[PDB]
Structure 1
Amino acid sequence: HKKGLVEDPIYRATKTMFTETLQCVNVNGGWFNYGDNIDECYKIDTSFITDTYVKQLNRYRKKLLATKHIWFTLGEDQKIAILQECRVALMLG
């Protein structure tokens, strides 16, 4: 829905890599609006366990499992552009 926003000046000064910047993306960058009903916001039911959802999750997870070996052979520039394409397709869907 929206990208995380980093207010931190040292993090904005230094962070460059993919995960090394992503570890600085916290809940306070827009997601944590006011925070008084957090315990109700994290008590969760598990009614998704159905037939077609579980097989779709399994087939896509194994697809990722089989292709993630080429992901580590990518460069920083690739990872950023590929994940931008993935985010654009995800909001499209």
Structure 2
Amino acid sequence: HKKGLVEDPIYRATKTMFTETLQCVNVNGGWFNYGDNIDECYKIDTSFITDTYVKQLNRYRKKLLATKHIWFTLGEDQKIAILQECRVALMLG
């Protein structure tokens, strides 16, 4: 829905890599609006366990499992552009 926003000046000064910047993306960058009903916001039911959802999750997870070996052979520039394409397709869907 929206990208995380980093207010931190040292993090904005230094962070460059993919995960090394992503570890600085916290809940306070827009997601944590006011925070008084957090315990109700994290008590969760598990009614998704159905037939077609579980098989779709399994087939896509194994697809990722089989292709993630080429992901580590990518460069920083690739990872950023590929994940931008993935985010654009995800909001499209």
Fold match (TM-score > 0.5)? yes
Q: Deviations over 1:8-27 (max 9, x none)?
A: 00000000000000000000
TM-superposed CA distance for 1:31, in Å, is: 0.0
Once the two structures are aligned, what percentage of the paired residues are identical? 100
Query: 1:4 and 1:55 mapped to 2: Cα distance?
Result: 31
Query: 2:8 and 2:83 mapped to 1: Cα distance?
Result: 23
Q: Deviations over 1:14-54 (max 9, x none)?
A: 00000000000000000000000000000000000000000
Query: 1:20 and 1:43 mapped to 2: Cα distance?
Result: 30
Per the normalisation by structure 2, the TM-score is: 1.00
TM-superposed CA distance for 1:83, in Å, is: 0.0
Query: 1:17 and 1:68 mapped to 2: Cα distance?
Result: 19
4+ residue segments displaced more than 6 Å: none
Query: 1:14 and 1:76 mapped to 2: Cα distance?
Result: 16
Match of 1:16, SS state, is coil
Please name the residue that 1:58 is paired with: 58
Question: Which consecutive residues of structure 2, in runs of 5 or more, have no partner in the other structure?
Answer: none
Question: Which consecutive residues of structure 1, in runs of 5 or more, have no partner in the other structure?
Answer: none
Please name the residue that 2:19 is paired with: 19
Per the normalisation by structure 1, the TM-score is: 1.00
Please name the residue that 1:4 is paired with: 4
